[PDB]
Design a protein around this ligand. Structure first.
Ligand SMILES: [Mg+2]
Ligand SMILES: [Mg+2]
Ligand SMILES: [Mg+2]
Ligand SMILES: [Mg+2]
Ligand SMILES: [Mg+2]
Ligand SMILES: [Mg+2]
Ligand SMILES: [Mg+2]
Ligand SMILES: [Mg+2]
Ligand SMILES: [Mg+2]
Ligand SMILES: [Mg+2]
Ligand SMILES: [Mg+2]
Ligand SMILES: [Mg+2]
Ligand SMILES: [Mg+2]
Ligand SMILES: [Mg+2]
Ligand SMILES: [Mg+2]
Ligand SMILES: [Mg+2]
Ligand SMILES: [Mg+2]
Ligand SMILES: [Mg+2]
Ligand SMILES: [Mg+2]
Ligand SMILES: [Mg+2]
Ligand SMILES: [Mg+2]
Ligand SMILES: [Mg+2]
Ligand SMILES: [Mg+2]
Ligand SMILES: [Mg+2]
Ligand SMILES: [Mg+2]
Ligand SMILES: [Mg+2]
Ligand SMILES: [Mg+2]
Ligand SMILES: [Mg+2]
Ligand SMILES: [Mg+2]
Ligand SMILES: [Mg+2]
Ligand SMILES: [Mg+2]
Ligand SMILES: [Mg+2]
Ligand SMILES: [Mg+2]
Ligand SMILES: [Mg+2]
Ligand SMILES: [Mg+2]
Ligand SMILES: [Mg+2]
Ligand SMILES: [Mg+2]
Ligand SMILES: [Mg+2]
Lengths: 103, 67, 89, 51
RNA sequence: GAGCUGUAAGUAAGCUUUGAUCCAGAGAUUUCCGAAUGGGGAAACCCAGCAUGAGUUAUGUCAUGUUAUCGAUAUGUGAAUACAUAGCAUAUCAGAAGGCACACCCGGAGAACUGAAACAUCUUAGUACCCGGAGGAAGAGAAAGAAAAUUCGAUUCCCUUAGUAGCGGCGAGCGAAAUGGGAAGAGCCCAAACCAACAAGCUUGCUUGUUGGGGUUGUAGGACACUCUACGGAGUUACAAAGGACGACAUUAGACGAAUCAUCUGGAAAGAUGAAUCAAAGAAGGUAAUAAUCCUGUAGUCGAAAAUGUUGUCUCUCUUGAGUGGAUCCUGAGUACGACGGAGCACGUGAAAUUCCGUCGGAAUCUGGGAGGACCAUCUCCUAAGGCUAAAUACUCUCUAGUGACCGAUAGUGAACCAGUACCGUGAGGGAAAGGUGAAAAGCACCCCGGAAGGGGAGUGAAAUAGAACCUGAAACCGUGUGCUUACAAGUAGUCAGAGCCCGUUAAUGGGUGAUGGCGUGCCUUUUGUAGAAUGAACCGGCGAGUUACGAUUUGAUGCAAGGUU
């Protein structure tokens, strides 16, 4: 269960083994978007505040299950557990200790 | 907003209602006469009248229950 | 009351030509009479009203998205204030 | 022979293995298995009730 | 716990770690119509009255209450009539109405087609449909029983008994019960004798009355008359009833939760290959293809502010139990029974007992009364004419959790799709058809033709004959090309025999075409007999008909056998 600022690794796709930071997450259809990965090519006609433009190479969404968090000790991809520390709920790395990502 | 609407008097609640109902009328009136462009003020003033009428109903509930 | 029973102004090219005279057109609530439209417009705008004219319009059939239905019924008042004016932009 | 609650849980998840009481033997899990593994207390128990 | 402003895209305005959106618990608001209830009315609208309140110089207007009907309780008043009642008068109460899955249940009423190869008795069938009732179940339920043993001991339901007994134009067909085996499994209260007051007639005593006590049963009980005994018990489900306390779990939101990598092919791997790992999790669903170890989960474990839900223990509330004598008294009257006419009992009025209804008749009091399939007699059993009662049983509009040798879009609900909806009918009523881009919208920027539609490029994508009518796209049908044929010929359109001209196969004594010759009157259904001018089919595609349960009988098979079987 990856959050909005996390450094992740992709398992499946065109790009696999690739790093990148998630920038939006789309929860109710669980498709995150990772920078550099799934670069689409739109065909936009000219808009009210835009030029015509050819292809618009922006990032598409990746499924959440294709994306995995890394270990802050090993830099292996890892699953995520949960610990109760002073009432809050933090994210265990399941191979090592704490992963720290406010932003 | 239900923490300072409780702090009002039940005689300032009935004035803050008709203050907000004049406000809700003005930016519903200049929504038709089309110079508004900030239309989220309409919903937040409709809910404020609903906060102001929920606490000014449960005053009268408590005022009738302990009586 | 008294601002629940005026909903909107009516700004058309039939209505702006009546504002060349002292006549102002309002889309009032459907449950009201023209006496309390008069007693409401001189409470909001502080004018003095000579006459007022009501008419009901029926629901107008519209099809948006190729599914059929109706518009709301609406009640239109035309107030005819003696002196003063209603400031509009 | 009787219901061992820890054998019936330690074999519950392996595909192919089935735990059965000696009272609960039927023809369709005997003939489904390639091999029985009975105990001492169950071999004497199925011997008494089947003959 | 990080996004959010329904489906629903969008933009534009915004809102959120000070915790939004969402999820539960509780609460507030809750227009109008509708039993609709101030009056009316073509439901979702008119018109009020009254009392307050705002406003206005005053009206006009507006706000808030309150006003249907019978019903209950009150006091007013009291007609024809003198008292009295009728009736009117206010003032309280909100009791009734209406609705349903009303499926199941109990009552009131109650067909017909059909079967009997007609048909009337009979059957269909107390069925359907109407009504009225209700409840989570109802109904039934504590022997005037079943029986005939050394009998049992409320009711209901299940298995048998048994298609037996029996009924029946003894036709069609109906069709039990007891015993035995099981589920479930408790009994109570009242009237009456009598006693106590109380109250009135009345004459002081009796009667009547209320209330309280008393006591409810066949082994004859109880009043009574005796003797000997008390707060231990009992409990809101009957047995009389309210409401505490403190727990217990139970739902109504949730929270953790094991373990994989690499290479190959691919657009993408979960596949293949190689090496691991977890398992109280190898249920399942997702993820770009087929995943125990990617995700959601699962096994397991944990959790509740607040709401109810049951359920304990205290609290609380009620409450003496026996015995003997039975002299006397009491033990349910227009009842039981009888007659006549019906209905119900499996039983068609009969050898009809037993149970009800109408109409008239009309009893007995423990030495009583009822029943034991007519009737007597004798035995045996029971104690009618008062009432209440859980459970085992029925049903599913639903809710929660699941399941399927159940359906896959002409199926499966009519309805997988903004369905009882387009639509049809004056109305009740009838009622459709219509799922599939891709993994991801990346949904074709630009260029060209064109008024636009459309196209041709380019571009995206693994694929664009995946382009939004969008997965595959079969036939009928419509075309455009062709190789071989055809303008002297009579044709169920083929079939054998065959020259010529083309072609080269799942390579085998091949494929296409057919100058010409021989033979040859479609297919079903119906018939003695059909080319039939007898029926049916325009064609193509889908759909579209001996099934299931129960019983019976036969074989076949397999047990074991004078036994076999539940
Ligand atoms: Mg909160
Ligand atoms: Mg009315
Ligand atoms: Mg009323
Ligand atoms: Mg009124
Ligand atoms: Mg009713
Ligand atoms: Mg008949
Ligand atoms: Mg017949
Ligand atoms: Mg019958
Ligand atoms: Mg009847
Ligand atoms: Mg109920
Ligand atoms: Mg009952
Ligand atoms: Mg009863
Ligand atoms: Mg006896
Ligand atoms: Mg792999
Ligand atoms: Mg493998
Ligand atoms: Mg595929
Ligand atoms: Mg669990
Ligand atoms: Mg009696
Ligand atoms: Mg009799
Ligand atoms: Mg008897
Ligand atoms: Mg199909
Ligand atoms: Mg269908
Ligand atoms: Mg075009
Ligand atoms: Mg194709
Ligand atoms: Mg597909
Ligand atoms: Mg297609
Ligand atoms: Mg010729
Ligand atoms: Mg035919
Ligand atoms: Mg003939
Ligand atoms: Mg024949
Ligand atoms: Mg023919
Ligand atoms: Mg003919
Ligand atoms: Mg024909
Ligand atoms: Mg056909
Ligand atoms: Mg047959
Ligand atoms: Mg047989
Ligand atoms: Mg046989
Ligand atoms: Mg045999």
């Amino acid at each position: 269960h990856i959050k909005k600022g996390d450094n992740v690794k992709v398992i499946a796709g065109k790009d696999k083994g690739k790093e990148g930071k998630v920038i939006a997450t789309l929860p109710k259809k669980d498709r995150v978007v990772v920078e550099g990965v799934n670069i689409m090519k739109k065909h936009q006609k000219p808009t009210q505040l835009n030029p015509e433009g050819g292809i618009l190479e922006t990032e598409a969404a990746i499924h959440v299950s294709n994306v995995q968090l890394l270990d802050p000790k090993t830099n292996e991809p890892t699953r995520v557990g949960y610990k109760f520390v002073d009432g809050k709920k933090v994210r265990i790395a399941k191979k090592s200790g704490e992963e720290i990502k406010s932003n | 907003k239900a923490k300072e609407i409780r702090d009002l008097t039940t005689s300032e609640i009935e004035e803050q209602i008709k203050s907000s109902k004049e406000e809700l009328f003005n930016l519903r009136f200049q929504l038709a006469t089309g110079q508004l462009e900030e239309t989220a003020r309409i919903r937040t003033v409709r809910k404020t009248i609903a906060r102001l009428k929920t606490v000014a109903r449960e005053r009268e509930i408590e005022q009738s229950k302990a009586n | 009351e008294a601002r629940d029973i005026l909903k909107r102004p009516v700004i058309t090219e039939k209505s702006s030509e009546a504002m060349a005279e002292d006549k102002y057109t309002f889309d009032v609530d459907t449950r009201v009479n023209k006496t309390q439209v008069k007693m409401a417009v001189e409470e909001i705008f502080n004018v003095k009203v000579a006459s007022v004219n009501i008419m009901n319009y029926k629901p107008k059939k519209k099809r948006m998205g190729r599914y059929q239905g109706y518009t709301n019924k609406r009640r239109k008042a035309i107030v005819t204030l003696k002196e003063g004016s209603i400031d509009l932009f | 022979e009787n219901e061992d609650v820890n054998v019936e849980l330690s074999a519950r998840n392996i595909p192919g293995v089935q735990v059965t009481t000696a009272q609960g033997l039927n023809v369709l899990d005997i003939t489904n298995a390639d091999s029985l593994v009975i105990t001492e207390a169950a071999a004497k128990k199925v011997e008494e009730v089947l003959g």
